[PDB]
Amino acid sequence: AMRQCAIYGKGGIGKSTTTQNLVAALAEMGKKVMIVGCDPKADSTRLILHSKAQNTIMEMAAEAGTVEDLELEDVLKAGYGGVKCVESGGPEPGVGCAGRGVITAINFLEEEGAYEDDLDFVFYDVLGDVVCGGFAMPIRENKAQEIYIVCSGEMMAMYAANNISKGIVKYANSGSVRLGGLICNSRNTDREDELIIALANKLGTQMIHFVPRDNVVQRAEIRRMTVIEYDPKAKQADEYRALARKVVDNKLLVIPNPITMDELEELLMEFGIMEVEDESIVG
Amino acid sequence: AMRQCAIYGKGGIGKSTTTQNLVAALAEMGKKVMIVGCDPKADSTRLILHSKAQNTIMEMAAEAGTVEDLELEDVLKAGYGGVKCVESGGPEPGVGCAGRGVITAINFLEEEGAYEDDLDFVFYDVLGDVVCGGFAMPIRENKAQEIYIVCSGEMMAMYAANNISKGIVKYANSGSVRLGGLICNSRNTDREDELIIALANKLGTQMIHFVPRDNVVQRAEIRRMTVIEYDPKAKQADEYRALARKVVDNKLLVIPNPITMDELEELLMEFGIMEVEDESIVG
Numbered sequence: 001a002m003r004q005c006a007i008y009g010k011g012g013i014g015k016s017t018t019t020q021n022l023v024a025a026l027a028e029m030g031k032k033v034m035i036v037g038c039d040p041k042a043d044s045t046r047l048i049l050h051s052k053a054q055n056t057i058m059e060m061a062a063e064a065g066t067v068e069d070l071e072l073e074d075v076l077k078a079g080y081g082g083v084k085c086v087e088s089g090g091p092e093p094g095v096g097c098a099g100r101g102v103i104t105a106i107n108f109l110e111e112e113g114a115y116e117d118d119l120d121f122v123f124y125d126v127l128g129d130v131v132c133g134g135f136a137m138p139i140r141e142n143k144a145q146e147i148y149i150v151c152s153g154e155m156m157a158m159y160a161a162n163n164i165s166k167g168i169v170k171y172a173n174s175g176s177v178r179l180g181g182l183i184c185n186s187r188n189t190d191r192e193d194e195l196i197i198a199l200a201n202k203l204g205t206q207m208i209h210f211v212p213r214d215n216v217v218q219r220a221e222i223r224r225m226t227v228i229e230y231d232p233k234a235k236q237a238d239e240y241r242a243l244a245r246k247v248v249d250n251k252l253l254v255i256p257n258p259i260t261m262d263e264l265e266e267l268l269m270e271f272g273i274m275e276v277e278d279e280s281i282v283g
Numbered sequence: 284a285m286r287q288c289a290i291y292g293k294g295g296i297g298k299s300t301t302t303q304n305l306v307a308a309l310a311e312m313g314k315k316v317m318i319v320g321c322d323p324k325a326d327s328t329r330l331i332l333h334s335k336a337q338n339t340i341m342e343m344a345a346e347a348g349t350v351e352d353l354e355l356e357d358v359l360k361a362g363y364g365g366v367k368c369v370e371s372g373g374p375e376p377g378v379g380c381a382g383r384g385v386i387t388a389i390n391f392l393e394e395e396g397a398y399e400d401d402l403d404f405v406f407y408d409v410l411g412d413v414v415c416g417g418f419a420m421p422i423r424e425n426k427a428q429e430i431y432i433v434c435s436g437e438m439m440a441m442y443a444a445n446n447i448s449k450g451i452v453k454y455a456n457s458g459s460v461r462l463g464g465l466i467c468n469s470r471n472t473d474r475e476d477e478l479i480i481a482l483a484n485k486l487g488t489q490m491i492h493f494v495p496r497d498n499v500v501q502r503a504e505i506r507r508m509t510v511i512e513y514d515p516k517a518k519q520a521d522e523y524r525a526l527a528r529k530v531v532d533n534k535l536l537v538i539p540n541p542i543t544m545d546e547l548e549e550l551l552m553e554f555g556i557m558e559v560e561d562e563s564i565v566g
C-alpha cells in the first residue's frame with residue numbers, strides 16, 4: 001500500500017519546510033517517501049537534496065525534446081534518508097497557466113511507474129493561493145487522497161484553507177480526495193492553537209499538529225538541510241517527529257464543511273488574535 | 284488626465300489595507316479615485332464602503348442575466364471621500380480560472396465609460412501569487428501603466444515582486460506598463476527598510492514608502508474603516524499620507540531588471556534578516 005498525500009496552503013505559510021521536515025522524520029522511521037514539487041517556486045526538494053533547488057521536469061523536457069523522451073531514472077533524485085524528489089516547474093510569469101507544469105509532471109510520473117509498490121508515501125507540495133488549473137489537478141483528478149493544509153491565525157491562511165476545502169467538496173462525487181487535517185505553523189501569538197483547533201472543528205477535521213516558530217529552521221535551511229538532518233537533538237526535530245507520527249496514525253479523512261467569511265471573522269475575534277499587542281514569548 | 288495604477292503582491296502582504304488607506308489619503312487631498320478589486324477574496328473595498336464587502340460583478344451579472352445587462356450606475360458604489368468601488372469576483376475554488384472575473388470586470392468598466400475624464404486615479408488591487416489569466420491581464424493588456432508592489436523582507440514576498448517584474452518585462456514590447464515602486468509593509472525586523480531599498484535598486488525602481496506595522500490598522504478595520512477615516516490624527520494616518528504624496532509626485536516608471544534567486548538569497552543574507560532573533564521594537 002501507499003498513501004498519496006498533498007500539502008496545500010497559501011504562499012510562504014511553511015508548506016515546503018513542513019513537508020521536507022515531516023518526510024525526513026518519516027524516512028528516519030524507515031518509511032520510503034517521494035516528494036513531488038507542485039509550486040512554481042520549485043525549491044520544495046532542496047533540503048532533502050542538499051541543493052540550491054532541483055531542475056524541473058519542464059526544464060529537462062525542453063532540453064530533451066519532449067517530456068515522453070525523459071527517463072524517470074534521470075528525473076528522480078534521492079537525498080536524505082533515500083527520499084525521492086522531483087520538481088514540476090511551470091511557465092514564466094505572464095504566460096498561459098502557472099499550474100500547467102503540475103499536470104505534465106504528475107501524468108509523466110504515473111505513466112513511467114514512479115509509484116513503485118514499495119513507496120509508503122507520496123507528498124505533493126502544492127501552491128494553494130488559487131484552486132485552479134494544475135494546482136487543482138491533484139484534487140480534481142483524485143491524485144492525493146489525503147489533503148493536509150498548512151495554515152496559521154492569519155486571515156489569508158485560514159481563507160486559503162477554506163478555499164482548498166471548497167475544492168475538496170466540489171470533486172467529492174467521484175474519487176476519494178479527503179481533508180486529513182490542518183497543520184498550524186505558529187506565528188508565536190496567544191490562543192493561535194485554540195483558533196486553528198476551532199477552525200478544524202468547524203471544517204470537520206482536526207489540527208493534526210501545532211508546529212512552533214523556531215529560528216533553528218533558519219539555521220538548518222542556510223545549510224540546505226531539514227532540522228531532522230541538521231540537528232537530530234533539536235526541540236524542533238521532535239516537533240516534526242510528532243507531526244510524522246500523527247500523520248502515520250491518522251484515520252480521519254473527511255469531506256469538509258466549508259465556512260462563511262462571517263464564521264472566519266467570528267473565529268479571529270473569539271480568540272482575540274487581532275487584539276494581541278505582542279508575541280506570546282517575546283524573543 | 285488619469286493615472287491607471289495597480290497594487291500587486293503576494294496574498295496577505297497588505298495590498299488591500301495599503302490601497303484603501305492610500306486612496307483615502309488621496310481623497311482627503313481632493314483626488315477623485317476608483318478602486319477595482321481584482322482579488323477573489325473580494326474585500327478590497329470594504330473599508331471605503333463601511334461594509335462587510337461588496338457584491339461582485341460576477342454575482343450581479345448572474346442575477347441580471349448577462350454582464351452587458353448590468354448598469355454601471357447600479358455597479359459602482361461610492362464611500363469615504365467619494366471614492367468609487369467595484370469588485371470583480373471570480374469562480375468558486377476548483378473551477379476554470381480564478382482570474383476570469385478580472386477580465387470580465389475591467390472590460391465591462393471600460394465599455395460602460397467608468398473611466399470618467401474627471402477621475403485622477405484608478406487603483407487595481409490584484410492577486411500576485413501567480414501571474415497568469417485575469418491576474419496578468421492588467422499588465423498584458425496595458426490597463427495599469429504604474430505597478431506598485433507591496434512586499435516585505437519575507438522571501439515569498441520578494442519572489443512575488445520579482446515575478447510581477449518578469450511579467451512587466453514580458454509585455455514591454457507594446458503598451459506602457461512600468462514598475463513604479465516597491466512599498467515595504469513592515470514585519471518590524473532590523474534592516475528590512477535597507478533590504479527592500481536594495482531590492483528596489485537591483486530591479487531599477489525605488490522603495491516609494493516604508494509602511495510601519497501599527498496595531499491601529501486592526502482597530503480601524505474591526506470598525507470597517509481606513510485609519511485615515513478611523514483616526515485622522517494617528518501616526519499611521521500620516522504614514523499613508525506620506526505614501527500618497529510620493530505616489531502623486533512619482534515620475535520614475537521603469538522596465539525592471541528581474542534578479543536571480545541567487546541575488547534574492549544574497550540580499551536576505553547581506554541584511555541579516557534570517558539571523559534576527561526578535562522584532563526591532565518588541566511589543
Ligand SMILES: Nc1ncnc2c1ncn2[C@@H]1O[C@H](COP(=O)(O)OP(=O)(O)O)[C@@H](O)[C@H]1O
Pocket residue numbers: 009010011012013014015016017018185186211212213214215217218221438439
Ligand atoms: N516552524 C518554522 N519556524 C521558523 N521558520 C519557519 C517555520 N516554518 C517555515 N519557516 C520559514 O518560513 C519561510 C516560508 O516557508 P516555506 O516552507 O518555504 O513556505 P511555502 O513553501 O509555503 O511558500 C521560510 O523562510 C522558512 O524557513
Ligand SMILES: Nc1ncnc2c1ncn2[C@@H]1O[C@H](COP(=O)(O)OP(=O)(O)O)[C@@H](O)[C@H]1O
Pocket residue numbers: 155156292293294295296297298299300301468469494495496497498500501504
Ligand atoms: N501596516 C500594517 N500594520 C498592521 N496590520 C497591517 C498592516 N497592513 C496590513 N495589515 C493587516 O494585514 C492583514 C493582511 O492585509 P491585506 O491588505 O488584507 O492583505 P492582501 O490584500 O495583500 O491579502 C490584515 O489583517 C491587515 O489588517
Ligand SMILES: [Mg+2]
Pocket residue numbers: 015016017039041043044125
Ligand atoms: Mg514552498
Ligand SMILES: [Mg+2]
Pocket residue numbers: 298299300322324326327408
Ligand atoms: Mg486583499
